[PDB]
Amino acid sequence: ETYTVKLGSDKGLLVFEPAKLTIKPGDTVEFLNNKVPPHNVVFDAALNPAKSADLAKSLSHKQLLMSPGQSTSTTFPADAPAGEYTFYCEPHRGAGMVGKITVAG
Ligand SMILES: [Cu+2]
């Protein structure tokens, strides 16, 4: 199936759930918003095993998360390089809202 990180605890603060993530090279991962939007999901082109700027083009999205309960299901491509990615939030940056996809090799 696909992995999903319900960012935002509920009575504590904002933090992906879980914080890290383990997927395969091409698996799918759905991200959503809780009750403290807007949330921004993207993959920095510096915290990756292949510092580049292509697989992200079809991975990171834009526009604020105006959907309460869902953000954007990024279907990682078959090029997903093993190692560990690193996405974060633009607004909730001071809330440990920084997760990372771990695609074993
Ligand atoms: Cu967020």
UniProtKB/Swiss-Prot annotation:
Cofactor(s) listed in the protein's UniProt record: Cu(2+)
Domain Plastocyanin-like: 1-105
Subcellular localization: Cellular thylakoid membrane
Binding site for Cu(2+): H39, C89, H92, M97
Gene Ontology molecular function: copper ion binding; electron transfer activity
Keywords, in A-Z order: Copper, Electron transport, Membrane, Metal-binding, Thylakoid, Transport
Pfam assignment, any one: Copper-bind
InterPro entries, alphabetized: BlueCu_1, BlueCu_1_BS, Copper_blue_Plastocyanin, Cupredoxin, Plastocyanin, Plastocyanin_cyanobac
Membrane topology: Peripheral membrane protein
GO-annotated cellular components: plasma membrane-derived thylakoid membrane
CDD domains attached to this UniProt entry: Plastocyanin
Reported function: Participates in electron transfer between P700 and the cytochrome b6-f complex in photosystem I.
Family membership noted in the UniProt record: Belongs to the plastocyanin family.
Protein's recorded name: Plastocyanin
